[PDB]
Design a protein around this nucleic acid. Structure first.
Lengths: 69, 122, 134, 375, 153, 120
RNA sequence: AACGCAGCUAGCUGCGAGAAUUAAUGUGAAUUGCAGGACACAUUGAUCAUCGACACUU
RNA sequence: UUGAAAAGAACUUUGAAGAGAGAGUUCAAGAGGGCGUUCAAACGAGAACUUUGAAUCGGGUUCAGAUCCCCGAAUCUUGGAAAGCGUCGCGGUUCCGGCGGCGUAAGGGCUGGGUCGGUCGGGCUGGGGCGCGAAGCGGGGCUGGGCGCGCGCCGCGGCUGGACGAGGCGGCGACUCUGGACGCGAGCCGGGCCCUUCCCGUGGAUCGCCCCAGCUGCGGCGGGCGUCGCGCGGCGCCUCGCCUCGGCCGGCGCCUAGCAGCCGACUU
């Protein structure tokens, strides 16, 4: 499990050919985006909830998006 | 049907392999129908299929070896099963031609002095 | 007596060549006579018993004139079963009594192609036995 | 105690209400046969008409149990009983001159009628049936009248059993070894005071003796074979099960628990078929465990030798204080079968001959009772 | 009737021993037809099979006494049964004093109350068992400093 | 100055080695493969704890021959039934057979493959 | 020597993944503890004997 | 080593049984299968002894295997709370064997050893901006009125099945009641939708806060004097009572036989 600090290199790590699914978990304080790939489950931890609804909308098609809340 | 052995002996290999590997299907099905209780109408057939699968394979092999005898007839060397196997020490025995060779001295003494058929009176 | 050095007059060997003899030779041990009229249609004296041919007992408890046909030949125990020769088991069911084929005479012969050989093979051999008397 | 006997009017009215709906659908389905009608379609048609007219009657009252007691069973020449096929099973397109045995039952309020009949496909009205078919069918029909008239109160199972033996072997045929003709009660399709025929020694040493009593409702089944009378299953899949109530076992497999709970939600201790579940795979792999742990008793389809003809007649009968009484009878014309062999035992001839002139009315037996003291 | 099976599976799904597994003696028949784990778990939420609480080993007999041996009530001359080297090791006391005295003597070096030419003198004074405890080393420094600050006068 | 040896030990030279080219084959025909697909798998299992596997774990279990490894089991289940095998496991059971836990692919379902076979 | 093979089988017996036997030749209606299924008995043959063909795991 | 042949003991009867008593087969059964710790309850027939109760890793799973099977990760935080565990509650009794709530005397050590002004963390105020009950907007729906709707409660009508009384010196026809199921009389009463209306969501103003702008001080307490009130309270000065909000820098200020507070052990 790697932890991605910035948002810009999360979209390219999610729009790779081998990235299988995205699972979004909304905690109390923050929202964790989790993308499953061949080797790693990458995690993006972000707290600003106005950006979390932006980032769900800005996701590539054909990529599974099952929320966990 | 009646899987007769002399019936099968005129055929080619493909239909002897066709009729084999579907007979190997029903034997596999009866073994499925033997582990689920079954019924003697099905389970008295297991021997009927097995001794028929044994019958098709012998008609294959007897015809296969028959073609190998026909091919290595006039050869100096045959493979080590296409040559006869009476017993071991009867293969170390001399062949018929060399089993009675007489030297040139020997067949002069048999030519000049043959055994005569005499008869002694009294 | 017996002037053959290669067959035995031994008791325990004649019994062993009988009580575990193979079952095709065991067929002809279980032979049987004919009637006095069916030795005249054919020219045979005795003949091996068959699954289905009419027969009658001549010795034993079931002695009678009832022409009842053979319904089983059972070579493992040297015995045959007759149709109307049965016996009431005490249960209520009814079992057969088995009798030895030397004790029954055949008054009707199940005739087909394999019988017509062995009934003509035994027939030709009994005229050859009558030309050694001339 | 709570469960009522036949000592009420509505009880016998429900027995009539089951028997005549079974007779109506049975006559319509026998007439609706031809050379070619799919057996699966026949079983669907039978359970469809039973469901149709069960939905027609008594629908004001929301809690009354009524419907398919015993599902439709359509057997064959060689076959014996209980042949209800499936969707994935192999079906027989029917054909000229085939022994068809039709069996079905209807329950009202836990009161059960069962009826079976045996006949020939498409013998024409000018043409007549001969041979060993006619031999075994007239054999089983005289066994049917021997059951219909040799059962009276005070008897045992032994008399009718060992008269069936003489009837069928005067026809030179044989009753199949080990059947049970059943005691019927309230929600109980099989009690214990029954009828055996042709028993083996353990199953008759353990067959507990009993006496025909009064206020009693029995179903009689006759399956006479034109051969040896020793039937056994051939690997054909049993599709009819019933629920045995006293058994308690908690199933480990989720599939079998779902199956056994749906059985509780659809029919409590009633016989049924696997077609009703319409996703039969889950039902098959549940019913394996259910049949293994004695929770469903099966109705195993049996056959006999190739070339056989086994004839079946099943009817219920009711014990009044007048005696036994016929409530159902399969539609049979005994004149069409030409059998050279028949019953030759002269006492049994007169015994079966006596009741042939008796089946005229059901009131002439009581009408002459006032005339007994007249001379 | 015989519940050796149902006692064993219950202790597994409760993660306890069989000592702490209570079966209901009135509803024996509902417990007795339980051949699986899920059917045991069914009878635990339904309150027939109960995990008993642990038996009481309280510390109240031995904690009051700790509060009295914190004050010295049970020590005495005749409640001790080891040597004074086995009760409190005499190495550990020396290995404690030299922690205490060298650290306070190191406190005065970077706080500039003593120079090095007294610290290295007094370090060997501590080593040789001259100074009994901390309130003896400390005013020995105060008298030692004052006369040395008087040799500057 | 040509026959020179700077090595103080006479190591044996390397002579040419021909390969075999015999006058006649030793045995008559190549033998027929006796451990084919129909002899790998003997029968499937139908026990009640084998039925915790078909629905609840998506797998068949067969009794296969002891001389069969997991590639020969995988090639056989695919060949007989035209299906897709995920992974296979084995254990030689104390009766002396070899019980294989072949797991089918998640696209396939073992409830319907056991339907075509017939243990259902 | 070891291990395997019977519908119901552990021992003895027989046999080798063609596994209580296949083919061929005689013979000519059974084997049998229970069953089942072949078997016009010449549109070819159950059974047993023979044994020359074929096969024969470690 | 039964007997010629299994004809190897049907049936009845006592017993939970092994075992017997009649009966039957046989020339023969003097031939019957090696034969010429305590107490109580439960199940059981039977209780001192039975059972129940009282004295390469993580997670799950079986009647029996799991670092091997499934799920998931791999070769303070991501994994991580979506899992476990502790409680609390609903549904349900072989689908039910499912789901939600809340929680997780002596012996030592730590800080500061200080006065005041400039700077900063700041604390505070003005201009502008942000969140909102409520007027209002989009509207969802247990409200207030109407309509199809319960294939209803109660009673009525007709049809059909069943049953019964009666009778002939083996012969058949007539009479009456009720059950099913329908229709009728809305006489009766229960479940949903349409309009303001009950009810939340969004944008602007007060009110609460923040950005920008102004200074290194701002917010708050107690006693005497004055003292007024529409449950809430309040005010101005002095203070030998006050916290001087604190850090860095700088005239500015030195405990010095060493304090002040805080914590903490077991020993003699």
């Amino acid at each position: 499990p790697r932890k991605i600090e910035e948002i810009k290199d999360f979209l390219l790590t999610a729009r790779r050919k081998d990235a299988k699914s995205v699972k979004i978990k909304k905690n109390k304080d923050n929202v964790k985006f989790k993308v499953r790939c061949s080797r790693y489950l990458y995690t993006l931890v972000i707290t600003d909830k106005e950006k979390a609804e932006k980032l769900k909308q800005s996701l590539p098609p054909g990529l599974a998006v099952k929320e966990l809340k | 049907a009646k899987i007769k052995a002399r019936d099968l002996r005129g055929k080619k290999k493909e239909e002897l392999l066709k009729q084999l590997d579907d007979l190997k299907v029903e034997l596999s099905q009866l073994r499925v129908a033997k582990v689920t209780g079954g019924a003697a109408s099905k389970l008295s057939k297991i021997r009927v299929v097995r001794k028929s699968i044994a019958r098709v394979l012998t008609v294959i092999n007897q015809t296969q070896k028959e073609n190998l005898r026909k091919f290595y007839k006039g050869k100096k060397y045959k493979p080590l099963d296409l040559r006869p196997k009476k017993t071991r020490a009867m293969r170390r025995r001399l062949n018929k031609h060399e089993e009675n060779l007489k030297t040139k001295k020997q067949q002069r003494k048999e030519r000049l002095y043959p055994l005569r058929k005499y008869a002694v009176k009294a | 007596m017996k002037f053959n050095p290669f067959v035995t007059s031994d008791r325990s060997k004649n019994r062993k060549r009988h009580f575990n003899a193979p079952s095709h030779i065991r067929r002809k041990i279980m032979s049987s006579p004919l009637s006095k009229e069916l030795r005249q249609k054919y020219n045979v004296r005795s003949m091996p018993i068959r699954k289905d041919d009419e027969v009658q007992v001549v010795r034993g408890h079931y002695k009678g004139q009832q022409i009842g046909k053979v319904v089983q030949v059972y070579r493992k125990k040297y015995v045959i079963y007759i149709e109307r020769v049965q016996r009431e088991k005490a249960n209520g069911t009814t079992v057969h009594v088995g009798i030895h084929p030397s004790k029954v005479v055949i008054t009707r012969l199940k005739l087909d192609k394999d019988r017509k050989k062995i009934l003509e093979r035994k027939a030709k051999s009994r005229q050859v036995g009558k030309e050694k008397g001339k | 105690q709570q469960e009522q006997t036949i000592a009420e009017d509505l009880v016998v009215t429900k027995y009539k209400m089951g028997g005549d709906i079974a007779n109506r659908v049975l006559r319509s389905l026998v007439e609706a046969s031809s050379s070619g009608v799919s057996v699966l379609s026949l079983c669907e048609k039978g359970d469809a008409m039973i469901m149709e007219e069960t939905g027609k009657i008594f629908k004001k009252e929301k809690e009354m149990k009524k419907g398919i007691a015993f599902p439709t069973s359509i057997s064959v020449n060689n076959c014996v009983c209980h042949f209800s096929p499936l969707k994935s099973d192999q079906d027989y397109i029917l054909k000229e001159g085939d022994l068809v045995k039709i069996d079905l039952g209807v329950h009202v309020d836990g009161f059960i009628a069962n009826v079976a009949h045996t006949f020939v496909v498409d013998v024409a009205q000018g043409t007549q049936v001969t041979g060993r078919k006619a031999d075994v069918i007239k054999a089983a029909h005289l066994c049917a009248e021997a059951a219909l008239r040799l059962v009276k109160p005070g008897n045992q199972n032994t008399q009718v059993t060992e008269a069936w033996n003489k009837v069928a072997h005067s026809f030179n045929c044989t009753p199949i070894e080990g059947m049970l003709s059943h005691q019927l009660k309230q929600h109980v399709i099989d009690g214990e005071k029954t009828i055996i025929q042709n028993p083996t020694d353990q199953q008759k040493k353990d067959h507990e003796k009993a006496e025909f009593e009064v206020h009693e409702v029995y179903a009689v089944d006759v399956l006479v074979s034109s051969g040896e009378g020793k039937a056994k299953d051939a690997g054909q899949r049993t599709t009819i099960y019933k629920r045995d109530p006293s058994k308690q076992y908690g199933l480990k497999m989720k599939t079998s628990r779902a199956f056994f709970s749906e059985v509780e939600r659809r029919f409590d201790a009633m016989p049924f078929t696997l077609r009703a579940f319409e996703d039969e795979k889950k039902a098959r792999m549940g019913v394996v465990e259910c049949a293994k742990h004695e929770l469903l008793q099966p109705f195993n389809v049996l056959y006999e030798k190739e070339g056989e003809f086994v004839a079946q007649f099943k009817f219920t009968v009711l014990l009044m204080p007048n005696g036994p009484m016929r409530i159902t009878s399969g539609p049979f014309e005994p004149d069409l079968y030409k059998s050279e062999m028949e019953v030759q035992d002269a006492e049994l001839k007169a015994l079966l001959q006596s009741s042939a002139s008796r089946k005229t009315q059901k009131k002439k037996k009581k009408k002459a009772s006032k005339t007994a003291e007249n001379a | 009737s015989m519940l050796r099976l149902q006692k064993r599976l219950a202790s597994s799904v409760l993660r306890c021993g069989k000592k702490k597994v209570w079966l209901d003696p009135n509803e024996t028949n509902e417990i007795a037809n339980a051949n699986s784990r899920q059917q045991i778990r069914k009878l635990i939420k339904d309150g027939l099979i109960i995990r008993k609480p642990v038996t009481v080993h309280s510390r109240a007999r031995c904690r009051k006494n700790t509060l009295a041996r914190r004050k010295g009530r049970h020590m005495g001359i005749g409640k001790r049964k080891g040597t004074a080297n086995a009760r409190m090791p005499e190495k550990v006391t020396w290995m404690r004093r030299m922690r205490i005295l060298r650290r306070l003597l190191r406190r005065y070096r970077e706080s500039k109350k003593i120079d090095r030419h007294m610290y290295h003198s007094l370090y060997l004074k501590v080593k040789g068992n001259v100074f009994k405890n901390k309130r003896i080393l400390m005013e020995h420094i105060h008298k030692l400093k004052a006369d040395k600050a008087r040799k500057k006068l | 100055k040509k026959k020179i040896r700077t090595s103080p030990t006479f190591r044996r030279p390397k002579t040419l080695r021909l390969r075999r080219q015999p006058k006649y084959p030793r045995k008559s025909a190549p033998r027929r493969n006796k451990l084919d697909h129909y002899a790998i798998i003997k029968f499937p299992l139908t026990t009640e704890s084998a039925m915790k596997k078909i629905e609840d774990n998506n797998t068949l279990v067969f009794i296969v021959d002891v001389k069969a490894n997991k590639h020969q089991i995988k090639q056989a289940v695919k060949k007989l039934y035209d299906i897709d095998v995920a992974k296979v496991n084995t254990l030689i059971r104390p009766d002396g057979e070899k019980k294989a836990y072949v797991r089918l692919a998640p696209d396939y379902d073992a409830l319907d493959v056991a339907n075509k076979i017939g243990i259902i």
